[PDB]
RNA sequence: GGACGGGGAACGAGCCCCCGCGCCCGUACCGAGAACCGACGCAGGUGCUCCUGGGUGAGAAGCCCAAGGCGGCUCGGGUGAC
RNA sequence: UAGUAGCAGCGAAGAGGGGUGAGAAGCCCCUCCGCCGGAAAGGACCAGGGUUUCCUGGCAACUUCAAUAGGCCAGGAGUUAGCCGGUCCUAAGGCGGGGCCUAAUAGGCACCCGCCGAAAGGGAAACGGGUUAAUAUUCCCGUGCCGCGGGGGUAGGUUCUGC
RNA sequence: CCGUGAGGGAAAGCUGAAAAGAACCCCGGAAGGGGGGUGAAAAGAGCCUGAAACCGGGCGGCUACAGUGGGGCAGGCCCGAA
RNA sequence: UAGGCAAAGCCGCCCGGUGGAUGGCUCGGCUCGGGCGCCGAAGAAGGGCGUGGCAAGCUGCGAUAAGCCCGGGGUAGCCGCAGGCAGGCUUAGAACCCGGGAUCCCCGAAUGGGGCUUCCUGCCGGGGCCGAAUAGGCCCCGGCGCCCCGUAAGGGGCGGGAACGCGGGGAAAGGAAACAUCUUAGUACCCGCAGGAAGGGAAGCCAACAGGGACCCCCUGAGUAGGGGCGACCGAAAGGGGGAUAGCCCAAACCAAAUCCUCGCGGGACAACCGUGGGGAGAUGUGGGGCUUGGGCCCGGGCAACCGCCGGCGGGCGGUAGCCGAAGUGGGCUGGAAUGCCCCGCCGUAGAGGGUGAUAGCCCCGUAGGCGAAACCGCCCGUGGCGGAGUCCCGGGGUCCCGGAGUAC
């Protein structure tokens, strides 16, 4: 459950050895001020189908849909944050979730609504 | 030997099954980090004590 | 889609036996292709094996429940 | 008890010329058990069973079917060919 | 295998015809001047352990030649001083 | 040191022509020349080795040189038994339980009981031909044998014994 | 992995923010080389930095009638931007 | 005469090749502190072999084989190390984590018997197959170890574990400037046997006429007394200060079967126990009584009697997953990219620490702080059920009986 130790070696070992259900917590991204008043929560784990605004990096200011989430890498792919390889294919830049802000929420999942009510309280 | 006991033969079978390098797709999957196997041996050089 | 443990429990023993026989035959055919180097659906052998394990698990539970 | 069929060049030649199917079975299976299993599963008659253990530790059985059943037809029916 | 004894049944053979069953493990290849041991594809050791045609000959000696194998005791060429 | 020593000595060695190939003294085919022939060499085979076997492909490394070769590398394949061996028996000997000994044991063993101990001793029964890239007394064809059990016939028996 | 065995036993970490892991053209039998690309940087998968010994090339000084290294003085050639 | 002018060779710098130092990094080590603490015939630990679509090793797993089922947590992704090619699984709730189950090859205490090959093989009982057969043969499943306890049914021991604990056997090297007594050392090591701790523990004590008051461990007494080729060297105890605190039973006197165990049936919180019947133990004494504030024995008085067995029900707390948790991603600059610089804000019970494209209180995880469990486990509290021969408290009387043997010596 992520160590309580203050030692950097144990903090990092917790991060790299975290099982999948803990790695989900690293997907949290801040909600936009508009969504914060509508939903009443400040953060949600990024989900495929959400729409995020990128706040840092080369694609800063680009808004797009999340197309894929990698729990192992703790990275997300966002429409628009792309480039082409030498063979002409379109590839996605892996963006850390702490660098994006969620501007539209995908709420078609009933299980996701339970998380919102828990944090709204 | 021509006349083998089965127990010895099955230990020889295990060594025969394990004597091979990692597949080429393993080399690709690990970015060339895994290229050798400790079970790789040559019948003339590394002797089993079977 | 794939047969869930709930649906397997509602089956009569005869249907479970017949399903088990089909899977073991399918596994024999698939392992033959694997030895020949080419498998039509490379992800299928794993699901057949776990399905067989599922049926055998429910079989043991149902016997124990009456025991 | 049957793990798979053998469909090599030698095995297919023995199917056509000698009415034999070649199978890999569990290493502890005996000729009696192999003959019973083949008859029960495939509804054929077994004339005799020859067995060997391969250098990779697997038991292989050359199973000769009686003179009313076709080894080639059985392999086709099973869809292993 | 035979004989010498004891007990039992009413059937019944070592002869002729006919029927059935025979599990399990080994089985490739080298077996050595490169597949064994000697750190080696090592002139050693293990195993020449067992077998071998014709001529000459006392000879399973040497020499020459079969059957059969080899030119892989895994550098090549030139020169023709010491 | 140094592009130096060694890659000689132990009684065989190559050559011509053709093919393959980017490339050939060296790989493949023929011809010529040689060595072994009671064998550093042909036939068989135990232990040991353990896939080195066979097929296809290959040449970064490996082979005292080269290589298109390979016991090397990659991919695939291959070992079929009532009668061949083990298995059975005991040998010299050994192990276990009991018992006796021991501070004690995983240490000892005269005793009792059991078992193990030979792929060269004893010991049931298979030979010839053909087949595969690679197995062959194992597969296939033909002709048999052994053990155990059964059916029929026969001799014989049915108080008593065959001639 | 070594020893029959009791036992004994190494070496070996690091692309990049992201594979964007090098398209395409020419040469080579091939490993590969040249051109041209990616990246802030080749950091090029033999991947951070990349010292010395050592070897190659360039440059400065010497070099076949003169016996070697170190120090001082005087001089020649060469460098002397910060 | 010197220069153009140069062989092989020498020195220095630059570039390149080789090499892998240095520097930075760190999911590794080490030391210290705290916790927690046994597993195995219900077949362990350890080992062999197998197991993935492409899979050699490691890791996991066991023919149901990187896995099967149920529940809780966790929601949208997943298919270990391990960044590839495929194909799938998953919103009918997966992956993942926690609890409980299932499966669990061969060898292994290994336990039918063997075992020169982790494999082979016997008998009995049941089942299947080949077969004309009910013969014969083959195969599958179960039982079959030794030594013991028990009337029997039944039950026990065996093997493992990093160190620690208890009993026994038991050196030398070295030191003494040689060396033998001695020391090293009751050490190394060996053999046996336990527990989560072990061992010790309740005065035939210590003291000195003043008094302590079971035991173990820590500090001291103390390198004191004492032992010793009185050499090297070895070495207490009582007492004092602390940690912690706890006291009882068997036998016997006296009574004499009033006793215990097991099974069937009825009752009884799934128990103890009660009623009844059978079996076993028991006069070579079960049981009652008794334990220095000695007891037995006799008389009287009193309940605050005393002593023991069961662990059901309710409640609480804790452990084994988790959930919530403040405050900038503000303007400009540099930059591939800011967490940096300049300017402006804000939180703080939170400025422990980590991550994020360079250095972040306010981007994210977290932190201060708060909450939480279907299931399993542990601790505490309240309540409940039951048994005994008054065994309990106080006084008097006793002068009779008991008070541990190859022991003390
Ligand atoms: Mg060798
Ligand atoms: Mg066989
Ligand atoms: Mg052969
Ligand atoms: Mg040689
Ligand atoms: Mg000839
Ligand atoms: Mg020469
Ligand atoms: Mg020379
Ligand atoms: Mg000669
Ligand atoms: Mg030659
Ligand atoms: Mg000759
Ligand atoms: Mg001769
Ligand atoms: Mg020979
Ligand atoms: Mg070959
Ligand atoms: Mg070949
Ligand atoms: Mg090979
Ligand atoms: Mg024997
Ligand atoms: Mg052959
Ligand atoms: Mg570098
Ligand atoms: Mg200057
Ligand atoms: Mg020069
Ligand atoms: Mg295990
Ligand atoms: Mg056994
Ligand atoms: Mg023990
Ligand atoms: Mg010392
Ligand atoms: Mg001394
Ligand atoms: Mg001395
Ligand atoms: Mg204690
Ligand atoms: Mg104790
Ligand atoms: Mg002492
Ligand atoms: Mg009594
Ligand atoms: Mg939170
Ligand atoms: Mg926060």
Automatic annotation (TrEMBL), chain C:
One example of a Gene Ontology biological process annotation: translation
GO MF, one annotated term: structural constituent of ribosome
The keyword ATP-binding is assigned to this record: no
Secretion signal, residue range per the UniProt entry: none
Domain of life: Archaea
Family stated for the protein in its record: Belongs to the universal ribosomal protein uL29 family.
Name assigned to this protein: Large ribosomal subunit protein uL29
Organism for this UniProt entry: Pyrobaculum calidifontis (strain DSM 21063 / JCM 11548 / VA1)
Species lineage: Archaea, Thermoproteota, Thermoprotei, Thermoproteales, Thermoproteaceae
Gene designation: rpl29
TrEMBL record, chain D:
Pfam family, one: Ribosomal_L23
One Gene Ontology molecular-function label: rRNA binding
GO cellular component: ribonucleoprotein complex; ribosome
Keyword rRNA-binding: yes
Gene Ontology biological process terms, A to Z: translation
Span of the signal peptide: none
SUPFAM superfamilies in alphabetical order: Ribosomal proteins S24e, L23 and L15e
InterPro entries in UniProt: Nucleotide-bd_a/b_plait_sf, Ribosomal_uL23, Ribosomal_uL23-like, Ribosomal_uL23/eL15/eS24_sf, Ribosomal_uL23_CS
rRNA-binding among keywords: yes
Subunit structure: Part of the 50S ribosomal subunit. Contacts protein L29.
Family: Belongs to the universal ribosomal protein uL23 family.
Record function comment: Binds to 23S rRNA. One of the proteins that surrounds the polypeptide exit tunnel on the outside of the ribosome.
Entry-linked HAMAP family: Ribosomal_uL23_A
Protein name (Swiss-Prot/TrEMBL): Large ribosomal subunit protein uL23
Biological source species: Pyrobaculum calidifontis (strain DSM 21063 / JCM 11548 / VA1)
């Amino acid at each position: 459950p992520f160590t309580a130790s203050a030692q950097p070696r144990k903090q990092r070992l917790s991060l790299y050895a975290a099982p999948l259900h803990l790695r989900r917590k690293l997907l949290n991204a801040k909600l936009s001020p508009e969504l914060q008043k509508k939903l009443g929560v400040k953060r949600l784990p990024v989900r495929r189908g959400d729409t995020v605004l990128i706040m840092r990096g080369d694609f800063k200011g680009v808004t797009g849909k999340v197309v894929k989430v990698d729990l192992k890498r703790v990275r997300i792919f966002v429409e628009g944050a792309t480039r082409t390889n030498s063979r002409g294919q379109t590839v996605y830049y892996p963006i850390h979730p702490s660098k994006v802000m969620i501007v539209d929420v995908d709420l078609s999942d009933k299980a996701r609504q339970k998380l919102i009510e828990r944090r709204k309280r | 030997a021509r006349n083998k006991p089965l127990g010895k033969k099955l230990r020889l079978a295990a060594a025969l099954n394990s004597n091979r390098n990692p597949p080429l797709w393993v080399i690709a999957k690990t970015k060339r980090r895994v290229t050798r196997s400790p079970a790789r041996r040559h019948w003339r050089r590394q002797k089993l004590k079977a | 889609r794939k047969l869930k443990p709930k649906a397997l429990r509602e089956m009569s023993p005869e249907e479970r036996r017949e399903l088990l026989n089909q899977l073991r035959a399918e596994l024999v055919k698939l392992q033959t292709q694997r030895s020949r180097g080419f498998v039509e659906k490379p992800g299928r052998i794993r699901q057949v094996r776990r399905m067989i394990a599922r049926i055998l698990t429910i079989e043991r539970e149902l016997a124990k429940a009456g025991a | 008890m049957i793990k798979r069929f053998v469909i090599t060049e030698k095995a297919l030649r023995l199917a056509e010329r000698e009415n034999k199917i070649t199978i890999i079975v569990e290493r502890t299976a005996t000729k009696k058990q192999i003959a019973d299993e083949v008859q029960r599963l495939y509804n054929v008659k077994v004339e005799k069973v020859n067995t060997l253990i391969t250098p990779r530790g697997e038991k292989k059985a050359y199973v000769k079917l009686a003179e009313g059943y076709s080894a080639m037809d059985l392999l086709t029916k099973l869809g292993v060919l």
